[PDB]
């Protein structure tokens, strides 16, 4: 029925599950929520030294039957004050749009997201007002991001 690319996607996710359990990226874990291999949950710790330090953030991860030839859908389920992550939890990250590659892995995705928490990209903002504040009133941006981290992510 050629829906058998379910087999392709499931084999790849099954191997990645094993590898991300034995060798998780620093300060991240991820795994299936339940019986559906295509629907994972993930925890990210706020990178040390960043305004998100001490935060615990939850992400949803949904693989498509086309995986790994189409990117997974990854959305933040914890509120975070960050110009590339909006209140829908949409993440503005190139490798999740048209820079996706089938050689990427969910571990690589989580590492990029951690890198994005460490260094936001205000040239490609999802929350314009946060990007503008980040560039013109850096200290105000960091004060509020630390307050969000404390109230919403601990």
């Amino acid at each position: 029925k050629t829906a058998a690319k379910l087999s392709t996607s499931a084999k790849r996710i099954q191997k990645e599950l094993a590898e991300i359990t034995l060798d998780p990226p620093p300060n991240c874990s991820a795994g299936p929520k339940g019986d559906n291999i295509y629907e994972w949950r993930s925890t990210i710790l706020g990178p040390p030294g960043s305004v998100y330090e001490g935060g615990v953030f939850f992400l949803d991860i949904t693989f498509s039957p086309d995986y790994p030839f189409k990117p997974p859908k990854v959305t933040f389920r914890t509120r975070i004050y960050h110009c590339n992550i909006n209140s829908q939890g949409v993440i503005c990250l190139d490798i999740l749009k048209d820079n996706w590659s089938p050689a990427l892995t969910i571990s690589k995705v989580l590492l990029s997201i951690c890198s994005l928490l460490t260094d936001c990209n205000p040239a490609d903002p999802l929350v314009g007002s946060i990007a503008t504040q980040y560039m013109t009133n850096r200290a105000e941006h960091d004060r509020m991001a630390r307050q969000w981290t404390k109230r919403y992510a601990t």
Partner: protein, 70 residues
Amino acid sequence: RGLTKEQIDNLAMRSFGENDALKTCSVCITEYTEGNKLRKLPCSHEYHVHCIDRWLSENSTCPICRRAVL
């Protein structure tokens, strides 16, 4: 968009040889096994035929280095 079936068939193709036993197709995270067929792109990155053909049906660049295949 990706490549025509003719452009795709014009890419290089060889059978698994014993030296490939130590290598991994980045798209399916699997070590090459005998009987496999491997495609090697101009940038010299290699994949299972079915693995990179599927990607080049709707895309035009190397999964690993992002160089244009043509």
